[PDB]
Design a protein around this ligand. Structure first.
Ligand SMILES: [Mn+2]
Length: 150
RNA sequence: CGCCACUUCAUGGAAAUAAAUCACUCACGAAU
C-alpha cells in the first residue's frame, strides 16, 4: 500500500511535469492525457519515467520482499502501458476503446488468455506462458494509417 | 676477260578486364 501510494503521488507529479493531465491514478491503475512531445521529452520518455517511478517505489518500500524472494526466483511487480495517439478531432470513446484494447488484450496478453478460456483450454502449463511487462503503442494519423507495436 | 641467274612473300600470343548496379526527398496533405 505504501509503495503504491508513493508511486501514485510521484506519477501525478511527473505527469504534470511533462505536461499531461491525470484522470485517475490510484491503486494499481493509471489513466492520463499527455501531448505527443513537450519540451524535448516525447511520450515514451514519460512512459519510461513512470516505469522508473514504479521500480523506485517498489525498491524503497518492498525492499524486504525483493531482497528475500525475487533473487531466488520470482517476477518482480511490474507495470504495463498502453499508449494511443490520435487526431484531436477524433471520437474520444473509440480512442479509449483503443487504449483499453492495447492495455488488456495486447499489453497484458489477455487476448491469449481470453481465446484460451472462451474455449476452455487454459491448462496450467498454458498459463505458464502468459506474458506481462509490455508496452502497447498505437498511432492513428489523419488518413487512417496505423502504426502499432508491442 | 667473256657470258649468265635463280629463290623466299606471316606465323605464334594477347580477342576484353575491373569500379560503380540506383542514391536522396516526399510514403499521403487539406477540407470534410
Ligand atoms: Mn487494476
Amino acid at each position: 500500500s505504501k509503495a503504491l501510494l508513493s508511486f501514485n503521488i510521484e506519477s501525478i507529479n511527473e505527469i504534470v511535469a511533462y505536461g499531461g493531465k491525470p484522470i485517475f491514478i490510484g491503486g494499481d491503475d493509471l489513466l492520463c492525457f499527455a501531448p505527443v512531445c513537450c519540451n524535448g521529452n516525447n511520450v515514451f520518455n514519460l512512459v519510461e519515467k513512470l516505469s522508473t517511478c514504479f521500480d523506485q517505489c517498489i525498491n524503497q518500500h518492498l525492499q524486504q520482499y525483493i531482497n528475500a524472494c525475487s533473487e531466488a526466483q520470482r517476477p518482480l511487480p511490474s507495470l504495463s502501458f498502453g499508449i494511443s495517439i490520435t487526431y484531436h478531432k477524433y471520437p474520444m470513446f473509440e480512442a479509449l476503446h483503443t487504449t483499453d484494447y492495447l492495455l488488456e488484450m495486447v499489453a497484458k496478453d489477455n487476448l491469449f488468455k481470453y481465446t484460451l478460456s472462451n474455449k476452455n483450454i487454459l491448462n496450467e502449463n498454458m498459463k505458464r506462458f502468459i506474458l506481462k511487462n509490455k508496452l502497447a503503442f498505437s498511432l492513428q494519423k489523419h488518413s487512417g494509417q496505423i502504426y502499432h507495436t508491442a
